[PDB]
């Protein structure tokens, strides 16, 4: 049985070479400022019926891509403990979609680290919940980010796991 693998890329997630992509979504399924701007531009039909509650994920095949809309919590709107539970739940929802649909690779941004961060640095919080959830899969996971300081912190965390 294959073990999951983790890499990090500092690049626009819309250019990924994986079988599926995770959109860091909002619950209403709206295309707004965030990862979803790039996902909507690349796969413009992938948002139809995408609305899904916080802490859940919803998949669509559209425009030749598998898009997984995962709704992390907005840390401005929940307590820290409640958001930590919901963030873990959103990544377990992604992992369940990966395993049940036999998806072999996935491009993933860090949920709740931008628009939904409550103005805090949540890179390691979000990454550690990504590892816990995606460890239940056999997928090749590629984490996407824009920030050089994030890219280093993510690679360091991946390296430790070895
Ligand atoms: C629309 O669905 C929109 O994405 C949502 O309403 C929110 O923006 C989601 O908020 P969240 O905090 O979960 O994530 P977001 O700020 O969108 O992005 C997470 C993380 O990813 C980096 N980022 C943003 N855009 C990209 C692209 N195109 N490629 C790689 N990485 C990207 C941000 O820096 C952010 O930290």
Numbering used by the authors: -1 to 160
From the primary publication:
Finally, we obtained a last GETV macro domain/ADP-ribose complex by co-crystallizing the protein with 3 mM ADP-ribose and 3 mM aspartic acid and diffraction data were collected to 1.45 Å resolution. For no apparent reason the space group in this complex changed from P212121 (as observed in all the previously described structures) to C2 and only one molecule is present in the asymmetric unit. The interactions between GETV macro domain and the adenine moiety, the proximal ribose and the phosphate groups of ADP-ribose are specular to the interactions observed in all the GETV macro domain/ADP-ribose complexes described so far. Lastly, co-crystallization of GETV macro domain with low concentrations of ADP-ribose and aspartic acid (3 mM each) led to a structure where the distal ribose is covalently attached to Cys34. This covalent thio-hemiacetal adduct is reminiscent of the keto-amine transition states involving a lysine residue described for DraG32 and Targ138. Conversely, in the structure of the ADP-ribose covalent adduct a movement of approximately 1 Å could be observed for residues Ser30-Val33 of the catalytic loop β2α1. This structural rearrangement of the catalytic loop is conceivably due to a positional shift of the distal ribose chain with respect to open ribose in the single open conformation, implying a rotation of the of about 100° around the 3″-C and 2″-C bond. In the covalent complex the hydrogen bonds between 4″-OH and the side-chain of Thr113 and the main-chain of Asp31, as well as the one between 3″-OH and the side-chain of Asn24 are still maintained. However the interaction between 3″-OH and the side-chain of Ser30 is lost, and therefore the interaction between ADP-ribose and GETV macro domain is loosened. Due to the rearrangement of the open ADP-ribose chain the 2″-OH hydroxyl group now interacts with the main-chain of Cys34 and the 1″-OH group coordinates a water molecule.
In this TRC, nsP3 has been for a long time the least understood nsP, but recent studies revealed some of its functions in viral replication. nsP3 is organised into three domains: a macro domain (MD) at the N-terminal, a zinc-binding domain (ZBD) and a C-terminal hypervariable region (HVR). Macro domains can recognize ADP-ribose (ADPr), poly-ADP-ribose (PAR) in their free or protein-bound form, or O-acetyl-ADP-ribose (OAADPr). In order to better understand this mechanism, we initiated a structure-based study of the Getah virus (GETV) macro domain, which shows a peculiar substitution for one of the most conserved residues in the catalytic loop, namely serine replacing a glycine in position 30. We produced the GETV macro domain for crystallographic studies, alone or in complex with ADP-ribose, and documented several conformations adopted by ADP-ribose in the binding site.
